Each structure stands twice: as C-alpha cells, then as structure tokens.
Design a protein around this nucleic acid. Structure first.
Lengths: 71, 94, 98, 53, 59, 112, 162
RNA sequence: CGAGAUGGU
RNA sequence: AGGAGUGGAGCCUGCGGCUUAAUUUGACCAACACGGGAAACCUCACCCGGCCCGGACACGGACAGGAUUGACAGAUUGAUAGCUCUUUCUCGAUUCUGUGGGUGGUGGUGCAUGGCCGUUCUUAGUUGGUGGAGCGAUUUGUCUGGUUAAUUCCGAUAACGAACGAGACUCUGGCAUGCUAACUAGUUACGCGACCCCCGAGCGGUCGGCGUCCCCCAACUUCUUAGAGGGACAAGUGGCGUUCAGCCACCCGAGAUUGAGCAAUAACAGGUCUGUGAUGCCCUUAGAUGUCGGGGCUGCACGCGCGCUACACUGACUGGCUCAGCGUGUGCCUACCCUACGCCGGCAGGCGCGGGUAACCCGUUGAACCCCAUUCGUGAUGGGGAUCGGGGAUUGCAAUUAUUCCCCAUGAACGAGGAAUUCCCAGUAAGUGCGGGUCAUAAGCUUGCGUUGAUUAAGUCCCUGCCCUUUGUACACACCGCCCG
C-alpha cells in the first residue's frame, strides 16, 4: 500500500542463443556415414539422441539431472 | 541436518585456504539456529539480522550456543520526552 | 508451454464423452480425481476450461469452492473436429426423459 | 518451474480453512463442522440446530 | 449437541451470545423370527426422516 | 481511535492525520512562514524567512480543522497583486519542520 | 466405509449435505422459479425432488438439464453410477411462497421497472392469493447518493413468541 | 433557601 | 441496611506515550482478557532480500535446417533458485513478441451501499378507516377516578369498530410406590454354589454377620432411563374494597414470586469493505499492491483498564479417612483420538499389550474445600513466593529474545490499603474444584456443571436516571441550546 522504490541489477529474463539445426552426422564417401557425438548408455535414450562434449565432460541433455561422465 | 552440512563445507574451505598465521575471510549465512560444533572454532561468520550481516569471530567459549545468540535483532531503547495523550491531565482544547 | 498436448487431449476427450466437468478451486493438489488419473493436475483442468469458456464453447457455474461446467452445441461442433470423430457421434446425453 | 515451491502445512492455521468461504479466523472444529463462525450462524437452520434457552 | 457463539460479526457492542443445540433420540426392539420375514415388516410406514438399522444376531 | 477534545459530537468523520503524510515543499508563488500574532476574524500576522512580514488569511478548507497557533510553521501562497496579503495552504508538525531544516530547505531562523 | 462413523458426526454431515445442494440449486435455477429441494433414500437409490413454478425450464428441450444436473450432482458428491434420480415438481399456490415472490420482484426491478409500481404489484398478488397479511421492504440508494428504505404492508403480522 | 461559571469536530 | 470487594504490593494481560528498518491495524455508559486476537514457522496485513505467471481472448509479426521448453559442471548466491555468467546438449507448434483487453488484491472510502449486530429503552409504548372540532400545522379515539408487573382491568364517555407490543406461546425446575417395559439399567429372593469370622439363641450348623464373590432356563420395576396422561385456578375460609376490578392473612398441598428464549413503531452519519465468489466508484497490475528465506507484532524513564496470589493460628506442613454433576473421544481434503492392565525410572517420562465409532470401553468418572491425628509458637516466622544459577524429559521442519513440563538452590514487596468507586435479595453472595472452546505443543481468559452455604431488606424518592400529566420559553444544530458589554 505505497509507492515503490526500485532495484538496480535489472534483467527481465536472459536471451536464448540461435544456431543452425544439425552437425552430429557426416557423409565421408558416397554411402558412408559417421556419427560425430555419442549416445548415452541408457533405456529410453539409447538411439538417435546425443551427449554434449564440454572441455572436461560428456553430458546427456535429456537425462539432465544425471548421465555425466568426467572425461 | 538435510542440506545444513553446506555451511560446514564452506567453513572448512575457508579454514583450509587462508594464508599461514592469518584469519579466514567471512562466510555469510541466514542459519541463526545452527549449534556451534567444535569444528567451527577460530572461524569468521556473518550472521543475518533481519536486514544486515554481523560478523563473529568464534571463540571456543561459544561452544554449544546458537549462531543467532551473537547477532541481535534490535537497538537498546533510550527515551525522548513524553507526548500529548501520555497522561489524563495532558488534554488539548483549541 | 501451458501443458503437453498429451494432457490437453485427455481433458477434451473426457469432457466430450461425459458432457460435464467438476473441479475444486485449489491449484496445489497433484492429480485431478476420476479418469484424469494417469497424470494430469487440476491446475491444467482449470486453465483448459477457462480457455474453452472465453470462446463460448462451455457454460460455467460456481458454489462453495467448486466449479461446474456444461458443454454446449458450438463446443460439440468444435470438439468433434479437434478429436477427429465421425460426424454422427453424440456419446454423452441423447435419450428423451419421461 | 521451481522444485521448492511449498513449505510444510501438516498442523496450525496454515492447514485448515472454511468449507464455504476459504477464511482462516474463528472457525469451528466441533462435531466435524469446519465452518467459519459467521458462516455457521448463516446455515445453522439448514444443518438442523435450533435455540430454546 | 451444543454450540455457543458471539452474536456480532465484527467484535463491537455489549457482549451477547447465541446458544444453539440439536437433540438425538434412539430406540431398540428385539424379535424371535426367521431372517426371511424381518425383510418384510421392516419395509412399511418407514417413509419419514428416521434411520432404521438391523443386525442378524445380538441375543 | 483516541479523542483529544471532549463532547457529544461524534457526528463527523475522523481526522486521520497519519500514515502517508508525504512531505511537501514549495512551488513557484509560495513561501515558508512562522506565525507572529493571531488576530480575530480568521486572520494572522506572519513572517517568512527572507524577511517580508505579511497579513495572512485561513483558506476555507482549513476552517475548524487544522488549528493554527503562535510560533507555528506554515506554507503560504503569494498574490501577483496586493503583495501585503497572502493565504495559508499547510501547517507543518514539529516532526516535519525538523525534516525541512535537515534537507537545508529553511534558513537557521525558524524555531522548533 | 470400512468401519462406520459415530451417530453425532453422521447426523451433522447429513445436514451439511442438504445445505450445499440448496445453494447450488438456488443460483442455477433462479430465473426458472426454484423454491426448494427434498431428498429421500431407499435400498441402493437416492431420489431428489425439486420444486419450481416453470417445470419445463428445469427439464429443457428433451430432458437435457435433468441429465446434466444428474451428472454434476453424482460427480461432485461421490454417489456411484445410476444411484441418483432427479424429479421436478410444480409449486402449489405460488402467491403464498416467500422465495418465489422475492425472486420475481428481483427480476422485475432488474428489468428497470419503478420501485413503488413493482412493490404494490407483488403486494396485490399476495393478498389476492389468500394470505392474512404481508410485509415487503426495499433498501439502499433509492433515488439519490444517500441511502433510504420503503415499507409496504397489508393485513395481520405477528413478531413475538413461538 | 451553603457554593453551582463555560462549550472545535 | 449490610456482605465480598476494587483503588495501596508482586506478577499476568489489553491501551496510550516513547523507541525503531518494522515495532501492521480497527474500537475512546454504548473503546481497553474486545476483533471469538492463547502471532516460534504458517496465520501476516508491517520491515530487509530473491524466484515465478497462475497476462483469457482478438488482430498483426516471427516460425518445421524449426516458435519455444528444460539442465550437468565451474563462477555466483542465505540457498542444490539453470536467477544470472561461461558451455552445448534437449523439447516440438503447447509457446514467444507488439497493440487492444482482461485478472487478481487482509489496497482506499463504513461519510457511496446490502446483510448482520449493538444502542436509544427493560420501560409500557405505537397506528389506520368512517364520524366530530379547527382557515391551518394539528387534535379526539389513546380519559377525571379506582386497580395492576403492564396503554392490565373496571368504569366513565363525541366517538364506533379494529391492528402491533404486553400476556398467551416454546424450553426448563420441583411432584406420581398410578400406566407402558428394559441381558447397552437395577432390586429383591432363592435352586443354590464359594471365601472369611465366631462376635450370635446356639458349634466349626439348618439358622447369624460381611460382598461391585459367581450362575438363574426365579420374580419384579421402589432406586436409573423416557414416552403418554394427571396437577394449581387466587380454587377454599376470614378481613378490606364507589362491596366491581382487585388487595392482605390462613387451612389443605410436591408446589400459592423457578429460570431462560422470542419481542413493536421511529431512529444513530454507532460498528463491520480485515467473514464471504455480497458490492458501486477510485487505485495498482511483470523492476506488481498475486510465493520462498530472515526479522517484527514481546522492544521500556512513564499514565490507565479487566484480573491472579497474599499479608497468616477461624493458619501452614506431614499422614489417615470418605462423597459429585454437566461433557468429550479413532478428523470423511485436512492424517492428530479417549485410555485400563503389566514391566523400567525419585520425577517429568519410556516399552509392551488389550477395549471403545460409545447407557456396552477409560468408569462404581476413589475431585477439591471439608473431616480425624501430628509438628511449629506471634518471630517478615516453618506466613508470602517475586527475581535469578545449574541439570533432565516431551511436542515440532525449527525452541536463543528463555513453548510447555520435572529437580536442587536463591528468598523481594507485602502487617488489611489516601481522595474515590463496582456488583449483589436465597440453594442467592462468597469459598472450592471439574468439563467445553481455541490446541502439533498450552490458561492467570471465557462459556457451562456440581459441592459447602451466611449476615442484611420486604422500603423510599434523598443522590443518579426512566414513565405519565399540568406549566413556562428568545431553544428546533433541540441546555453540551441561544446570547450581552
């Protein structure tokens, strides 16, 4: 029930980066395929879905609370 | 003590990483109802007061007390002179 | 997102089959009772039925902490389309009383 | 959406509220009524209570 | 059953009270008969707002 | 809440000089003044702190409500003509008058 | 119910049920001329009897509203499927029912008719219907920003004793 | 037959 | 006329003032243990910080090499809030974005309102129709007198005939050896059966005494429950009354005033928007006046209100004996109830194992004062128990600014209270303890119940007020009025 005195570390929300869709597959020869980033050893996520590569970890973005390997 | 061990990790980090024969930096917290354990002696804590953090150097005589016992929530009273309405004779007519 | 499309279809199919809906005004209970078991909260039911009312496709009433909703002829037309049902179906209420 | 979005409410004035109007002050727990005192004087005749003395 | 409440909705005035009550009346009857015929006689004149309950052995 | 006069006359709406009493400063055409004498007929003699004394009058809104007195601190509106005469706009409590002097708004002349 | 509840709780809960049902019907059937509800029990079945002045509005085009009201009463109060039946019944001597006269005066005022013309309109109809007397009162901002009230009265009217 | 003035909401 | 007091002391609790980041706020006979207001968190409105959308719908844009969603680790943070920063996986048309428009609010106005409650006001008061009187506002009816708790009756009469309040009415207390009839209530008696005592005419017995010791396929309704009827009318006798209406004493009788509920016309700038999905207008609406973490509502030179404990011998302490009534009980989202019996511990408390959804189990509800015996000896004392140190249990997510409970120690003021001032007429005042509410934990409050049980009155208008009539007025904002130098 008053006029409001304002904070000064202001953001509304962050901005989500924009990138092109797919770089996890390679064609090397006519009819030869390579998969560049690996699937996680898992029940539901065992095919077509990939672990991130960071500078010291491999991480599953789908199983996001877990599925992290320390190299 | 579910997720109240996090303060003890930050305290033992600060005890480990301080320069030799010099005091740690402050760790600052809301946890006023933490008991002083013998792990916590010779350590700097900032304990929240409802608007500010007051720093404490934990002496070993503080063992078994609460962290909130050393950081007080109010100012001691000292009186100004009484106002209108304070006594039955004090009445005002225009 | 407001809700997964899996939830939104399960509210509309239960509404179209039964012809009416009932819920209490509490956003915190984790599951709606009855055939909204298999995981949808009643917050999704309140928010779904509000969006259906402002289109004119349901009527609303309220007493003692409970909502009541009734389906109407423009809403029957819209849900039969959205659920892809045959044009001849009317599963809720049909037989004349005596 | 947050994982810590509620606090325990298994006793005290946070647990209970009126069945007619959702208010928390001056409610009646006697015989399983759970009405507010102002809502009870409004519905007492329909519930079946009377005054004689 | 008894409930006693302040009359005021807001806490002002001289301090009057309301005294509400409800009274409940109970009876028992015992019969010497087959289980097939209590089902007959316990089905007529029972139209008013009275509870009726029966148990197959208590004597 | 507490009455501070005593009578039958509960027939009004209560004064409530409380809560959001947001502090008021000058605009153009206004001055702060201290009351020097009170006359009959709803008028008074006042000195403003840049040193021009005036005869001054209670606005119709302040009648039998905001009781003015000798040595009290007030906000006054000047006239574009008839410079000897002015009208009262507000009274400051001794709690507000010290805040005006703490913001440096008053010369060191006013009594509190 | 794996073990039965005590008689004190049973008799209070049965009264709390009739109170909420009467509130729901009061605000659903207001323009349709509702005036009361009666409920009765028989083995495996509950019958609810509902009184109104314009019973065809309680039914709807082929009984739609009786089927919709049967569904929501069952859904809200937790009866098993098909154990609930609703019957509409016509009010006898509708001039001697105070609730039907309070609602018809409310809709007559809400349509913009003048206060005294409306109030003497119901006062005549109650006394022509065969009452011994009546009292009608309206209060609020009747003509201006400061509140007022009107009393309209005819015949006999008692105030004290049983 | 003691003394018994006055009136912001 | 009197009784118990209150005002004086210590402590509890509500209010003002002061203090503060905040100490949220309404209310001044008819406010102040009142908001059912006993705030650890929640409640919560106040103060310091941080996430979230739970911004319908319409129109336009952006968009399937994609509109948008979620997150590990390190830094950051009170925080395991992917809040934000670095990184690079993930989801799939549900969102995002601009404009219009909504929605919520213990925000503002009770001096814009509805509903409810209090008060004028616990007294006897109030009003049409037709007729009579006045140019009229108005008046009579609605009264000189007698009588009553009463505008209750009698009677009188330019009025006649009616309506509401009063009374009747509803609940409750006291009586029935008469009625109906009980293994969820008892008594008596015996087929009898069993333990103990010889105290008894008399044996260790048929026969006596004691029993909440135990069967009845014995008899019954006095004691308990609760349905129907009965009974009391100023009815009888003696006085007094315009001999009417009534009033006083007395016989007979369980009883010649039992106690509550409900209550008119006309008002008040009475209280409540903080009971509500009762509500107009105004304010605010994504850096929110719509959720979590910590603090405050308890802060203390001081003035006031409702209360608890006491100042002792008509007592305090330690043993022994023997008597109640009204109620509540496994929570229907919401997750907890009342307890016998056995064992461990000085105590608070702990473990085991049964009954109760209740005339069935806690329970024959072994209540306190009171009653009988002991110790102290007129001493601030073995009266009084404030203030304060140390240790142990129980509730809870959490007890420090001490939740409540138990133990040893410390041992204040206070010797019947100045001017003032409250309540009360019989199973009453006062003394004494027990249930219900609120309750995870918990009465010095409040709303009911039983137990012990007085002194003083049977009146008056003096003080403070109320009702009716005659009377005066410069008042009608109505004596808290109006008005002169």
């Amino acid at each position: 029930k008053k006029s409001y005195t304002t904070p000064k570390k202001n953001k509304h929300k962050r901005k989500k980066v924009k990138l092109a869709v797919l770089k996890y597959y390679k064609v090397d020869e006519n009819g030869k395929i390579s998969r560049l980033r690996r699937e996680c050893p898992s029940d539901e996520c065992g095919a077509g879905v990939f672990m991130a590569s960071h500078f010291d970890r491999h991480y599953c973005g789908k199983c996001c609370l877990t599925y992290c390997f320390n190299k | 003590r579910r997720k109240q061990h996090s303060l003890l990790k930050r305290l033992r980090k600060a005890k480990k990483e301080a320069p030799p024969m010099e005091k740690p930096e402050v760790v600052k917290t809301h946890l006023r109802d933490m008991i002083i354990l013998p792990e916590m002696v010779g350590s700097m804590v900032g304990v929240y007061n409802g608007k500010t953090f007051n720093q404490v150097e934990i002496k070993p005589e503080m063992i078994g007390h609460y962290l909130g016992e050393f950081s007080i929530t109010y100012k001691p009273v000292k009186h100004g002179r009484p106002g209108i309405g304070a006594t039955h004779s004090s009445r005002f007519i225009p | 997102m407001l809700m997964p499309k899996k939830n939104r279809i399960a509210i509309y199919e239960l509404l179209f089959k039964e012809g009416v809906m009932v819920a209490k005004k509490d956003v915190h209970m984790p599951k709606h009772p009855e055939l909204a078991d298999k995981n949808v909260p009643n917050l999704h039911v309140m928010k779904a039925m509000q969006s259906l009312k402002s289109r004119g496709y349901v009527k609303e009433q309220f007493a003692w902490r409970h909502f009541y909703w009734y389906l109407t002829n423009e809403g029957i037309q819209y849900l039969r389309d959205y659920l892809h049902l045959p044009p001849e179906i009317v599963p809720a209420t049909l037989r004349r009383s005596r | 959406q947050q994982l810590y979005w509620s606090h325990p409410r298994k006793f005290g004035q946070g647990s209970r509220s009126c069945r007619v109007c959702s208010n928390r002050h001056g409610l009646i727990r006697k015989y399983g009524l759970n009405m507010c005192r102002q809502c009870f004087r409004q519905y007492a005749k329909d519930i079946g209570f009377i005054k004689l003395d | 059953l008894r409930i006693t409440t302040r009359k005021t909705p807001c806490g002002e005035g001289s301090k009057t009270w309301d005294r509400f009550q409800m009274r409940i009346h109970k009876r028992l009857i015992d019969l010497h008969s087959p289980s097939e015929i209590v089902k007959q006689i316990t089905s007529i004149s029972i139209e008013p707002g009275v509870e009726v309950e029966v148990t197959i052995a208590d004597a | 809440n507490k009455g501070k006069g005593g009578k039958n006359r509960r027939r009004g709406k209560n004064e409530n000089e409380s809560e959001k009493r947001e502090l008021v400063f000058k605009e153009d055409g206004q001055e702060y003044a201290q009351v020097i004498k009170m006359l009959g007929n709803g008028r008074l003699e006042a000195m403003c702190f840049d040193g021009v004394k005036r005869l001054c009058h209670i606005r119709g809104k302040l009648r039998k409500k905001v009781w003015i007195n000798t040595s009290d601190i007030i906000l006054v509106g000047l006239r574009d003509y008839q410079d000897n005469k002015a009208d009262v706009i507000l009274k400051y409590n001794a709690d507000e008058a010290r805040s005006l002097k703490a913001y440096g708004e008053l010369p060191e002349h006013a009594k509190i | 119910m794996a073990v039965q509840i005590s008689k004190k709780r049973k008799f209070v809960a049965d009264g709390i049920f009739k109170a909420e049902l009467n509130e729901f019907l009061t605000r659903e059937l207001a323009e349709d001329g509702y005036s009361g509800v009666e409920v009765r029990v028989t083995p495996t079945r509950t019958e609810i009897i509902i009184l109104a002045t314009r019973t065809q509005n309680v039914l709807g085009e082929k009984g739609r509203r009786i089927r919709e009201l049967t569904a929501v009463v069952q859904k809200r109060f937790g009866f098993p499927e098909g154990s609930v039946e609703l019957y509409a019944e016509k009010v006898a001597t509708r001039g001697l029912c105070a609730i039907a006269q309070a609602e018809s005066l409310r809709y007559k005022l809400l349509g913009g008719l003048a206060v005294r013309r409306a109030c003497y309109g119901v006062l005549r109809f109650i006394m022509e219907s065969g009452a011994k007397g009546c009292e009608v009162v309206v209060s609020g901002k009747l003509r201006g920003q400061r509140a007022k009230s009107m009393k309209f009265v005819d015949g006999l009217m008692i105030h004290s004793g049983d």
